[PDB]
Design an enzyme around this catalytic site. Structure first.
Site, short mmCIF file in Angstrom:
data_model
loop_
_atom_site.label_atom_id
_atom_site.label_comp_id
_atom_site.label_asym_id
_atom_site.label_seq_id
_atom_site.Cartn_x
_atom_site.Cartn_y
_atom_site.Cartn_z
N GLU A 67 0.80 -1.22 0.00
CA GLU A 67 0.00 0.00 0.00
C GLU A 67 0.83 1.27 0.00
O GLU A 67 0.78 2.07 0.94
CB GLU A 67 -0.98 -0.02 1.16
CG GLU A 67 -1.94 -1.19 1.06
CD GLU A 67 -3.03 -1.13 2.10
OE1 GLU A 67 -3.01 -0.24 2.97
OE2 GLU A 67 -3.93 -2.00 2.04
N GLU A 70 -4.51 -8.65 -0.77
CA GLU A 70 -5.04 -8.41 0.58
C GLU A 70 -6.43 -7.79 0.57
O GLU A 70 -6.67 -6.80 -0.11
CB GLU A 70 -4.13 -7.47 1.38
CG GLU A 70 -4.49 -7.38 2.85
CD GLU A 70 -3.91 -6.16 3.53
OE1 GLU A 70 -4.61 -5.54 4.37
OE2 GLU A 70 -2.74 -5.83 3.22
#
Ligand SMILES: [Ca+2]
Ligand SMILES: [Ca+2]
Length: 537
Positions: free
Chosen positions: A138, A228
């Protein structure tokens, strides 16, 4: 439509797997038993085929991943690793929109790649060959880790990626599958050459943003993994809530059919809002995943199917190992009748398992197929996975030689014969001894063959001195009368004797019975399918 048309010859994505993350540093490692529950398939196990792990910024903690990662690789799973921060001498602070933030220092890119390389080789030295490693977790939601802009990622993908040897490179693992941070990689052939998998998370991602036309346009030979998520929330003690848990299967449906994702990886495996609870058992969210993970194995391809054939019903379908798999979801409050039509492929019967408010992978009666078609009842707020052997196929090799042993002492029916343990070397809990000179018998009633055909049946037995003839029956028909069993030379010397017989693809019976001369002591039976092209003399 109303009919759910499953086009078996119209191939979609190659499935890589289903899984989650083990994070010893933040929630502690899985225990030995949870590893089996997680990455074994078959009864009461999740059937996970992908393990995600942490790349710690402190290399003195790398050891922590090895035990679970090894085990997972022994269970046939793929492993990939994700960094959150570079080492802290490589990072500098800066103000980003009012908040103090971190990024990789521009003169430290080559060294950060060397840190990633070092992880890969540290694991390789401990017996774990990573399928892939990621540039950053991220990078576009990194308030608490290290930010990279699209250009910062791009620079690294051109200049430093592909100096990554020993594994595949994965990027950019955006939190919400934001195209702006992967577009630069796809539009540059030199950066694109160094990327092996486009990873994305899907937090907050809308159905309409699951499509990625540029990836379709320019991404041939690259994999696409959803690396994820957790859905729909992280509420406390929520893993078993119904019908809430049903949103897991809908999301996976969305990933598979709307995003053409090849892999779907959960956040923490063991968690109170995850697929395995803290007690080590499978949650209702776990079973939703199981509906894909346990039946749609690595190497299967997705096939086109009517995705939404009734307002609240969602269908996806997959083909592999000569099987079609279908996952059907009824989100609504009323039960539905759903007809399924198989095209460009054929089956006669269909197995099915259903999860709902009161059942977890419950096995339903084998329903059957008339001219490519079959109907089934989909309960309110349920997910049902269908399985069916397709016609006219095979892929072999060795191959079976799968070897399936059945003990002579348990799982069997004895007539005037008894189990004993005097002479050693037997497999199982013992062997069987015949009592009478004429017609004592052993009958197996549970011999289960994948296919019809000729089977080799190897008897493991002991016999001190005589020759001792047995009549042999398969499925109630006598295939051999007075088949000789030559001496082994001692009651402790176990010998082997192979015969050829024909058996169906279902449950068969085999019956051996004395005819005079008694029988030999019988340890077990091994039944192997004989290949086509091998029946030798
Ligand atoms: Ca005997
Ligand atoms: Ca035995």
């Amino acid at each position: 439509a109303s009919d759910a048309n499953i086009n078996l010859s119209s191939e979609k994505q190659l499935i890589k797997g289903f899984g989650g993350i083990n994070h010893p540093a933040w929630i502690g490692d899985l225990t030995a038993a949870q590893r089996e529950t997680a990455f074994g398939n078959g009864q009461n196990q999740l059937g996970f085929s992908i393990l995600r792990i942490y790349v710690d910024d402190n290399r003195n903690n790398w050891y922590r991943e090895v035990a679970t990662a090894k085990r997972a690789i022994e269970q046939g799973a793929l492993v990939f690793a994700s960094p959150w921060n570079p080492p802290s001498d490589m990072v500098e602070t800066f103000n980003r929109n009012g908040a103090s933030a971190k990024r990789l220092k521009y003169d430290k890119y080559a060294a950060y790649a060397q840190h990633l390389n070092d992880f890969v080789t540290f694991m390789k030295n401990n017996g774990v060959d990573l399928y892939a490693i990621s540039v950053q977790n991220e990078p576009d939601y990194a308030h608490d880790w290290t930010w990279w802009t699209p250009q910062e990622i791009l620079r690294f993908m051109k200049e430093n990626a592909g100096s990554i040897q020993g594994t595949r490179v994965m990027a950019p693992e955006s939190f919400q599958y934001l195209k702006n941070i992967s577009d630069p990689i796809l539009n540059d052939p030199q950066a694109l050459a160094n990327m092996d998998i486009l990873g994305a998370h899907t937090y907050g991602t809308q159905i309409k943003d699951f499509a990625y036309p540029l990836f379709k346009q320019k991404g041939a030979g690259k994999e696409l993994w959803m690396t994820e998520v957790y859905v729909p929330n992280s509420d406390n003690n929520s893993a078993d809530r119904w019908p809430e848990a049903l949103d897991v299967s809908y999301h996976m449906h969305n990933a598979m059919v709307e995003g053409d994702f090849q892999a779907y990886v959960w956040w923490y495996i063991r968690r109170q809002y995850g697929p395995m609870k803290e007690d080590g058992t499978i949650s209702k969210r776990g079973y939703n995943m199981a509906h894909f993970s346990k039946f749609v194995r690595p190497g299967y391809v997705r096939v086109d199917a009517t995705k939404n054939p009734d307002t609240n019903t969602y269908v996806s379908a997959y083909k592999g190992d000569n099987k079609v798999v279908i996952v059907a979801i009824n989100r609504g409050t009323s039960a539905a009748s759903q007809r399924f039509v198989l095209q460009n492929g054929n089956a006669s019967t269909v197995s099915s398992y259903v999860t709902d408010s009161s059942r977890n992978l419950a096995s339903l009666a084998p329903i059957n197929v008339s001219n490519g078609a079959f109907t089934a009842q989909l309960p309110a707020q349920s997910v049902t996975t269908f399985v069916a052997n397709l016609s006219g196929g095979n892929s072999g090799g060795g191959n079976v030689n799968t070897g399936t042993t059945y003990e002579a002492e348990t799982g069997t029916t004895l007539t005037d014969a008894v189990v004993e343990t005097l002479y050693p070397g037997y497999t199982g809990s013992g062997y069987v001894n015949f009592n009478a000179y004429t017609n004592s018998a052993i009958e197996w009633n549970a011999i289960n063959n994948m296919t019809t055909g000729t089977k080799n049946v190897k008897f493991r037995y002991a016999l001190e001195s005589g020759t001792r003839n047995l009549d042999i029956y398969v499925n109630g028909t006598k295939v051999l009368s007075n088949e000789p069993f030559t001496e082994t030379g001692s009651w402790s010397t176990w010998g082997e004797k192979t015969i050829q017989v024909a058996m169906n693809s279902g449950v068969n019976t085999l019956r051996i019975v004395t005819t005079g001369t008694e029988g030999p002591n019988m340890d077990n039976i091994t039944v192997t399918a004989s290949a086509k092209g091998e029946l030798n003399s």
